[model samples]
Structure formats: structure tokens, C-alpha cells
Target: KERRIGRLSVLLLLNEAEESTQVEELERDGWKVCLGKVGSMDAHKVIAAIETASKKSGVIQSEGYRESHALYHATMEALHGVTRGEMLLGSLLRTVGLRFAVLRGNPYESEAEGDWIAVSLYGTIGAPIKGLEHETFGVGINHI
Candidate 1:
């Protein structure tokens, strides 16, 4: 995700009708939607970056999430501007209702429970989306 940072218009691919609304909202808020084709985060590329970061930092939370954010920033140059996908950002974005624009409101059925919203906020492997799954389907290109 290349950023224009209020200097240049940002180009994004509006894949659906709902996504298009976000484009309008960005304009209303004083952003120039460049209206060119932008890209979704690349899973294979971003996933590998996370792995590399995890190995180098070698710091893991008690739950085993590695200290990858630092490396994500370090490697961001090669990562195509993918953002971090973690709980606090997800939670904060929820307050502003930004999460709803990128993801669905309802959680997909799971064998587990509690924090389904958080889980879906960033998304997981093999999760549901607007259509059928395939080699192109994925979720959570935000951090690991």
C-alpha cells in the first residue's frame, strides 16, 4: 500500500459496491482517491516477511506471538505497504467503525469462541469471504 500522505491522490481498487462507498468517504474527508488500481496485501510475500522477523527477533509473548512488528517496520520497504493486524489496532478501528468497511460484521462459524470479532477483524487462514475460495483467496495480510 503506497501512501500519498495527503500530498498525492491514493489509488485503490474498488472490488465491490460497498468498497466503492469507502472511496467516496475518503474524498468527503479530503482525500484524493487516485482511482487507479491498488492492490490487496500479498499473502505469500507478507507471510514470509513475518517469519523472517519472528526468527530474527526471537521474542515471543507468553501465547507465542513473536515480536514481529519491529521487523515488519524494518522490512516494510519490501512488503508493499501491508499494515499490521493486531488486537489493539483492530479494537481501536472498531470504535471508529473502520473495521466494518474492510471486513464483514458477522463472524464465521467456528469450533471455538470469545473474541470472534477480534479474530475476524484481522481475519485468519481458511476463513470465509464474499465468494468461493481458491488459490487467490486469503485473509489478514496485516501483520502475522
Candidate 2:
């Protein structure tokens, strides 16, 4: 029987709090977050918070469709300074179409309540590049 390969799904868990607070935490911890709509109200809230934090941290929110790539590259660069790797998995994941998901947020409020936030990546299995792992990459969110 032929072995089946599965797609890779990456998830980023985040704590929902004031934009400033969440941003500070991410920065202090050396993680990159993107601010943008991910096709959901909850996602919008998380993105808003990340955007606010990115601005306050002097890290501008990347523009255009390449923003995701830019953010991932920037993060890898930072990680390279501390760790040794040709490229980080997160960066690779972004290249493969990883996305963000919201586990909790307020749609009515202009400002994000920051209850919870998460990132998720989903792709089909049986791809050569993805290698063999699980049967398939299902949709899910991780709480940070």
C-alpha cells in the first residue's frame, strides 16, 4: 500500500488583552503578529489588537498581500539572531499559506476586548512537500 502524506497546519495561540498589552507581551517574547481581517469578525478583533500593538512597538503593519511574507521573514531574521537554523518552520509555514483565526473577540466593539486569539493553518494531505504525518490537516485554533 502507498503511504499517504498530509498537509501542514500551523496554529498560533495568543492571549486576548488590550492592544497595547498584547503587543507588549508578543514583542517582549519575540513573536510577530499580523493585523488584518481573516474573514471573520473574531479574527478582525484580534487583528485590530495586533495592529495597535505593532504601531506602539514601532513595528509598522506590513502592507499589501506580501505583508504575511514580510512579517514571517522579519520574525525568522529575529530568530536567527538567537537560534541557528537555515529557516524557521514558522516562516516556511507562512510560505505555504498559513492563516490566522480568532478563538474569542468582540464584533460590536471597535476596540478588541482581547479575550483570546489564535492562528491556524490548514492544507490538504498527500502532498509531497508536506511529507507524511497525519492523514489530513483539519481546522482548529490554539489558545495562547
Candidate 3:
């Protein structure tokens, strides 16, 4: 079995066409990678998929307060950006359509703080109203 490495991590919520290149880049750097396609604009689905992606990639396990804390903050950070609070507001008019990728592994040596986790999200955020849609990007990182 592969030995345990430090918890350097990355999460990518991006389009399929745009993700291949980054996936290759990270794979080249020896990161554990997982990809998913989300075909809905619902916030609940997005969060559920994120959890699945994280667990599948071994980035965050089902147990441990540290793991939960890292994911919680990462998710909050991704959901709450400039004018990107729709995800947390749970408004009936709000919509979020996005994709996601998650990665984990050690990317550095030496420093005790080398272990890290990151969540990056990019997508459309808006109400069902016409001309109200806008694109947004948010990223959050923490040591674990």
C-alpha cells in the first residue's frame, strides 16, 4: 500500500472543457485527483457532490474533527464571496450551476505546516430573474 503522505489538497469546481488541462497538470505533480459532473443548479446537490468528491479522493475522511473543520471552512469560503452569498441564503430564486474536482497529497517537504487543503469554486450565481445572472469565483485554503 502507498504510505501516508502529508495532507496537501486542492478542490476545483470548473467546466469539463477547462478542467482537463489542470487535471493533467496536477496529475503530473503527483496529486490524487477526482472529477465529477454536476448537471443541476441546486445548492444541496452541489454540497453533496462535493462531499462525495472529497471522500473518493481521500482528501477528507469520514472521521476526525480536523477533517470536518477543514471541509466546513473550505465550503463556507467557497460559498461566501463577493455577492456570492446566494448559496448560503437558501432563497427560492437563487441558482448555482457548477462543476467540481478534488485533489490530495503531499506537495512539499520540511515545514511542519506543509499539510494543506484548498477549495476552489467557479460558476454562475443568480436569481431566476432575467439579466440578473453573474459569474463568480471563490477559493478557500487551510492546514490539516
Candidate 4:
């Protein structure tokens, strides 16, 4: 059977209460949160749920840090059953930011069990008044 993954991206003012609440709610709903770093506790939780629901291997990619890059590559290889490509650098950068900010403890949410969700958040309203943006991509895989 094929699995489903969901990607979600949200942009909001950092200090907005709703954004934080929404993220917390989504986490309660079995969504995997990644701020930066692929092997985060939240990502593992989401992947665990995905495995439970779809009975397939769940792969989560967190933001790309030099230390974690090799592990990320290995995980992708195991999941996709293919070699890494050079073009993945940009994607890796994005993944790293997503892992550190969104999944870890950012004001955002992303869920994937058999479908994909990508989220992006942006705005200026916080301690430092910095912009915030996040994107998550999810998908399912079926073994033939």
C-alpha cells in the first residue's frame, strides 16, 4: 500500500499567540515539528505515527547542518534507495532552517501520514522584530 505525506508552511508574527497555540494543537494531532536538525524528537514522533498508520517506512529530513549532513544523506539514501545528487544543496539549506525553527520549537505546524504539507511563515513582530518563514514537504511511499 502507498503511504501519504502532508506538507505545510505558515507565516505569522513571531509573538502571535494563535500561531503558537495552533502549532501546539497540531503537534497534539500527530504532526511532526522540525525546527532544525533531521533527527529531532518531534520528527521522530511524527515518523512513528506515520509508520503506525501506513505500515511503511517514514523518512524525515531536518535542516542541513555540517555535522548532520552525512546522517541526512544516509537517511535519504535508505529511504529513496538512490544516491545523493549535487543539486540537493539548496534543498538542504531550506531543510536545516525548517528543522531548527519549525520542528524543534517554532511557531508553525506540519503533518504527514500519507499526504504532504508545506508551510511558510513570514512577518515582523517579536523581540528582535525578525522575519519568520517555514516550509514542510511530506509524501508517502508504497513498496511494490
Candidate 5:
């Protein structure tokens, strides 16, 4: 069974936001979220976009430490998924129908973790071999 955990559930919901109405619903429900089209196959550009979107939406604050902390974790998660858990920085071979979501909320069931910013990615990772590529998903959340 594909069961989703507490924090992960929030990211998954954001990942499914392919339309403005979907995003509106998430915001209406108390999530500070932003959705954007993936702009590059390079890991650094993708990560930068995530950080910029998070900051633009106010999900990432003005504090230097908090911004960097969130960026690191989110980038790690994206790399984890893109590299199939290997955590590498090589450029992706291909990205199809790519979409990204950045959100800020208390995703924890307990109050211990407090507020966190999460980045979620959804798309297909194409490989050199035909039929070898597959859909991929990644989500990372860090305390703010």
C-alpha cells in the first residue's frame, strides 16, 4: 500500500496542483503555496527556482539562515528523487511535463517541529533507453 505520512501528505497534495483552482484551494485551506513550471534540466537552476518561488510567495522569509536551511533540504530531496536516491548533481537527461510546488505550513502532527517550508516536484525523468524512464516525485520539508 502506498501510504502517505503526515508531512508528506501536504507535499503530495501540492504536487497534484496542476491548475490555478487547485492552488487556490490549497491556499484557502491555510497553505502558503506557489506553483510554477520547471525551467531547466540542471539541478542548480531547478533548486534556485524553488528558493525564489518560496521567497516570492513569502513561504521563505527574509532571514538569511532560514532561507539557506530551507534551500538545502529542498534541493536534497529533489536530487534524491531525480537520482533515484543516489543524491547526485548531474544534469537530468530529460524532464517532461514538469511542475513544482513550494509551500509553507506546519506539516507535523505534533507541535515539536513547528513551521516548515516544503518543496515538491512532479514529472517524468526520461532516460537514454526507451521505456527505462519513469514518473518521479520528490518532496522536502525543513523547519523555518
Candidate 6:
């Protein structure tokens, strides 16, 4: 259920890493802020974090997607940072012939509500680097 605009305002809780304008813009919009933890870009770590959060939330399999989104938002509020341009999961999906995507995180949630994270569950697919068939298949914060 998407809430109406102006119903809430969120501060971009960021972690320790690269700086982005999303934080300032959000602040200018009269949103609050929290300091998130900017850490590893490891794929396994990302996946595990989401899984761990979901389990902790006690979300059921029937509501996995909702739980995933919550976890992703929590992730954004927990990871380093990602810029709008840096959001490449969709482009990655294009190669696999999948037009649809679910960005474990949502900017709307932030702008409307504060308890949100800009992190995502998907990552660049069809690749091999550092012994990873799909490298960096984990979470990352976005400026959304």
C-alpha cells in the first residue's frame, strides 16, 4: 500500500563511506537522518544480511517479498551508500531477458516514512570474478 505524498518524511540514514547528494536533498526536504554502517560489498554477506533480517522479523514464506523489501530498506539504513546512477540491477536484469525487478529497497518509503533503507537484494548477474560465478550478488545502499 503506497501512502499519499507528504504523509511522512524520512532522513537518509547513511553509513561510513562515499558521500552522496541524496542525504543533503533529503535534509533540505525537512527529513530527519540516522547514521548507517557502510561496510562490505560482498555478495554472500548481502544475501545473508537480508536472510537474517527476514528470519528475525519472523516473516512467513507467503509474505517473503514484503519481508524482503523491509529487509532491503533496513539494509539501506545499514550499508554504505549507492547513487541513482549506480543503481545497475535493472540493467543487469536486462541481459538475462527479465524486464521486471524488485529493488529490495524503495525511496518512496523513505520520503513517506523514516524507517527505510535504500539497499537492494539483486546484483550484477552473468559474471565471474574472484571465484564468484555472480560477483557482488549482495546488498548496497542507493540514493533513491
Model 4, residue 93: displacement in angstroms? 20
Number of the top TM-score candidate: 5
- In the range 3-112, model 3's lDDT, one tens digit per residue, is 23212222345445567676677667756566665544555676678777877667678877777677667656665652344455545745656544455555465554
Give the alpha carbon lDDT tens digit for every residue of 56-135 in model 4.
Answer: 21223433453133323322323232112422233332323212123212222344223232222221111222364333
| Candidate 1 structure quality by residue, lDDT tens digits, 42-101 | 434443534443343322222444334433332343232223443213222121111111
What does the lDDT read for residue 62 in candidate 3?
85
Every model: Cα RMSD to truth: 17.2, 15.7, 5.9, 13.1, 4.3, 11.8
> Least accurate stretch of 10 residues (summed lDDT) in model 2?
1-10
Q: Summarize candidate 5's per-residue lDDT along 55-139 as a digit string, tens digits.
A: 7777667667767676678657754665574224324555454577667666545554566666667666666567765666777
lDDT of candidate 6 over 1-144, digit per residue (tens)? 242211222222212233346545444553333222213344345446445543443321334476555545545543333213333443432222101111222245445443333333233334323433332322343332
Per-candidate TM-score against the hidden true structure: 0.20, 0.22, 0.64, 0.25, 0.69, 0.26
Better of 4 and 5 by TM-score: 5
- The lDDT values for all models are 0.28, 0.32, 0.58, 0.30, 0.61, 0.34
Clashes of each: 2, 7, 0, 39, 0, 7
Cα deviation of 28, candidate 3, in Å: 3.3
Tens-digit lDDT string for candidate 2 (1-144): 121011111223222347556544544543444433222223334345444544444344355534333334333332233222322233323222222322222122345433222333222222235554322122322221
TM-score of 2: 0.22
* Candidate number with the higher lDDT (2 or 5): 5
Pairs of residues clashing in candidate 5: none
Off by over 4 Å in 6: 1-12, 15-38, 59-144
